[PDB]
Amino acid sequence: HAKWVGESATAPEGVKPTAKATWANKTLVAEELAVILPIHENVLADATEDLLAELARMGGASIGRALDAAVLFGHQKPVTWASKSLFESADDAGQVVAVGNSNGVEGDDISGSILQAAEMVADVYDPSHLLGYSGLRYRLANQRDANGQPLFQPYMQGTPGSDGMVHGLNTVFFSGNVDDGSNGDAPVWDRDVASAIVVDRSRVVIGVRQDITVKYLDQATVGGINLAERDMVALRFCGRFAYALGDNIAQGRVAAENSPVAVITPYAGS
Amino acid sequence: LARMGGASIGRALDAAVLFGHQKPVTWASKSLFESADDAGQVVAVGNSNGVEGDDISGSILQAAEMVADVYDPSHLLGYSGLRYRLANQRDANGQPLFQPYMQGTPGSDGMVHGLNTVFFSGNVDDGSNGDAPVWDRDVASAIVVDRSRVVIGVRQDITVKYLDQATVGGINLAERDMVALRFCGRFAYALGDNIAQGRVAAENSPVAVITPYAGS
Amino acid sequence: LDQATVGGINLAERDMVALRFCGRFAYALGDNIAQGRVAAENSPVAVITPYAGS
Amino acid sequence: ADTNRTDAAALIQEAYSDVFLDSVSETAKVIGTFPVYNMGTKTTNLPVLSTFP
Structure with a gap:
């Protein structure tokens, strides 16, 4: 920071x-993060469906949910991740907006609450992204006055508009x-703790160190099961990920x- | 450090x-907030749902009228996010005031009531x-001003000197292998606030x- | 140097000058090659x- | 015996990224907003009408 300074040769304010x-x-x-999916070789042979292709779909999806x-x-977040989870960042900053039961006479229906969170x-x-659970169009429609007219758009006639963009x-x-x-x-998203999150997308970094890889195992011991001795096989899935939040921009x-x-x-x- | 020295002076002037934060004692003019507050040109926002003019838009029109x-009046000074505060103004029935319906609602910040x-x-x-803070949000939501009645005097614009032999802060620069940047500028301010009325x-x-x- | 204070000497105030010399160096010895x-x-x-x- | 991450540690460089690195921003506004007068000396006098008949 600068200081207002004077014109003395000896007095303290002239330096x-x-x-x-x-x-x-x-x-x-x-x-x-990882999983192993063991199965018996006879069950793979007797099934009508390609159970290894199904288990290959299950393993990959299971990792992506756990990352989200x-x-x-912050659900089961690694202790080595120093950054706050998105919810924990907002909660500690006090950037939390409660929805109310006011018919919007308060600023506090969901569409008003999204603007308060965007302002924060x-x-x-x-802010550029709104994160939530689906069906938001049906909750944006059906917002009502103390008279029962719609708040969100003129009349009920064509009312469930697009989800994809909301308040910019x-x-x-x-x-x-x-x-x-x-x-x-x-749940991936607990609907009892948050209705939505507003975020500046640019302040989040997801590090991908290894994208999800699948290994077929037919001889390994997994979970205490000796696979070949029990006539079983398994699929192993893993990926390596990191997360950082650019949360504390300098101010002074x-x-x-x-x-x-x-x-x-x-x-x-x- | 050249960016930091320049920016640090501009913030202190604002x-x-x-x-009036750390305002030089030789500046006889009131600061912008102090001029309005002493003139009693202060509009408190209220919570009537705009049944009065006391909503933020009605308050901006009242402050502009004063x-x-x-x-x-020519400029509105404040902190950012005003678009989100002008959106979400509500009637006693809960309908929005500033624009027809919530669907397209965060409009432009850049021009408010002209x-x-x-x-x-x-x-x-x-x-x-x-x-x-440069702006104290506990005392003002915004300030309306006639731009033409403020004059900022620039006696010397921001200058940088590179020091490599001097003694500064008790540090002898050359015997320690240190260098320094010295930043300074000279500024004045006056407000043309009491036009004659009689x-x-x-x-x-x-x-x-x-x-x-x-x-x- | 001609304006600096060095070693308690205010150079300009005393009509002195100085030359200042410095360099930066490091050393490593590649001993203890592995044997087993x-x-x-x-x-x-x-x-x-x-x-x-x- | 297994050659763990600490036996290999001298082979394992950390990386660096500028993704969150920025200078200060110039936030100051009064010289951009209000009209500027170039002063030739420390003090300037501004005469104003005060009252009229």
């Missing part, structure tokens, strides 16, 4: 101040399940705290 | 002119090695403030 | 020492 600049470091660290859930909500990101960033944000829809750590299911002499992410939360009341 | 009386928008951001010296000395301002809704 | 299962100790250098007797 100009010294100052620093400082840099810091953020890290992508590649982490691996880690980046968005736009304060220090360029591109939409992205997330779905499916991931490991709950207890042999059940957890002190180290800044910001978020390129804002969260919209569902109406929790009665 | 904070002095707008809010300036347009003696002066000619005033050119100017957005301020960054930080300046707090007087204690910390940061203070045989008694007038009290006006070419500036009006819109202030955030503080209640509930 | 254990980390080996071996130098690329042998020293001949003078006769000590009298």
Whole structure:
């Protein structure tokens, strides 16, 4: 920062101040996630369908879902990933908007809430993507006045318009399940914690160290199963990925705290 | 470091002119906020759902009307995101005010009620090695101004000197293998705020403030 | 140098000048070439020492 | 025995990326916004009408 300075030869205000600049470091660290799908050779022979082609489709999709859930909500995130998940970034920055039950007399119906979340990101960033669960067009239609007229577009006549672009944000829809750590299911997107996320896409980096590879195993021991001795085979799937968030753009002499992410939360009341 | 030295001076000048932050004691003019506040040209936003003029658009029109009386309002000064605040203004039934329906709603920032928008951001010296903001959002949502009534005097524009032998901050540069950049500029400010109205000395301002809704 | 303070001497104020010399250097010795299962100790250098007797 | 990542460590360079590296931005606005007067000396006087009959 500059200082206002005076014109003395001996007094303290006639000398100009010294100052620093400082840099810091953020890290992508590649982490691996994987599964093995074992099956009996007789079942592969007796089935009508190509079960190895089906299991090959299952293995790849299972990894992509687990990556999404880690980046968005921090679900089973590797301890070596120093960056906050998208939700955790917004939540710690306090960039959180609750949807209300006001018929939009408050600013707080979902379309008003998207503008409040866009404003929070736009304060220090360029918001460009809206992340959520699908069917948003049917929730954007059917928003109503205290009179029951539509808020979103003129009349009900042609009302479920396109999902793809909303308030100048591109939409992205997330779905499916991931490991709950207890042999059940957890959702990729938990609809009870967030209705949507607004983000500046440019502040996210996904590192791809190894794109998903499949290996056919017919002799290995996997999960304590000696495959060849039990007349079984398996497919092994793995990929290596990293994530970093460019969250704390500098603002002055002190180290800044910001978020390129804002969260919209569902109406929790009665 | 050349970019940092230049930018650091510009931020300090803005904070002095707008809010009077660390303003030199020899500057006799009121800062923009202080001129409007002392003239009482302050419009508080309210929460009537615009049943009054007290919504932010009605408040901008009122603040522009206060300036347009003696002066000619030309610019709206504030912090960014104004498009998202002008969108999402609602009737007592919940319908939007500023534009017909929510579908296409974040319009342009660049021109609001015929005033050119100017957005301020960054930080300046707090007087204690910390940061203070250029725009204080706790006291102003926006300022309306007649641009022609502000004069910025440039006595010397920003200059850079490269130092390789000097002593600065107790550091002897040449015996330590150090170098430094020295940045300085000389600036003045005056506000043409009390146009004569009769045989008694007038009290006006070419500036009006819109202030955030503080209640509930 | 002709304006600097060096070694407590304000050069211009005393009608002095100075020459300042510097360079930056590094050294590495490629010893301990590997010999097997254990980390080996071996130098690329042998020293001949003078006769000590009298 | 297995030649782990720490036995190979001297072979494993970290990479560097400029994706998040930027200078300061010039945020200042008053000299762009308001009319500038080039001063020839430290002080300038601006006469104004104050009252009329």
